Swiss-Prot record:
Catalyzes the formation of sulfite from phosphoadenosine 5'-phosphosulfate (PAPS) using thioredoxin as an electron donor. It is found in: Cytoplasm. This is Phosphoadenosine 5'-phosphosulfate reductase. Its EC number is 1.8.4.8. The lineage of its organism: Bacteria, Pseudomonadati, Pseudomonadota, Gammaproteobacteria, Vibrionales.
Amino acid sequence: STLQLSELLSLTKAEQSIRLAEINVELEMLSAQERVAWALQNLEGAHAVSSSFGIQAAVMLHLVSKQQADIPVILTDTGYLFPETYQFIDELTKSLNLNLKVYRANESANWQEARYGKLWEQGIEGIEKYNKLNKVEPMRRALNELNVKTWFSGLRREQSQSRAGLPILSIQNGVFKFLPVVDWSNKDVHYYLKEHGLSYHPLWEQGYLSVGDTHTTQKWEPGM
């Protein structure tokens, strides 16, 4: 019927890889659409997709919302996303009719600066505290409050050497981690966006290879 997470959580990471070995080979042979369908039918709920609403965010949001219209979309608002990212979040929430769930620190950006100064300018300890306060704790709380057991993410092996071996299905932070486009190339992403009339993030046209916080995103070109 539905694969139970509690049995896999009592196994070591190695035992989990063995238990999910056959399924992973079977999922590789399916399309991203068949993989999401398989996850919605066979993995324990609740199901949720997270998105930073970056350059290629419309692919995962369209892919999963077309199979579960009311699937929760987890956004962790750091309070420092680019203005164009906030505009893109509003545009896709309306165009794809997304069930947007917003999570953030208990303290606003101005409260954090009043208490700590600018954490991103205070070395290793500053960046670590900033990430825990504005990315890690809000995501951990979202998974808990939304009762998530299956977590959809748009990670792809082609994004970096460190992600070259990512499996479609694994266990991370107590939930099933499902990556339906893990084997997609940058070309596959472009084809999908054009195929469904979806847009890239507005700053892609302005030379941003990626987007995050206004204070930490790399200065991709001179003049930035």
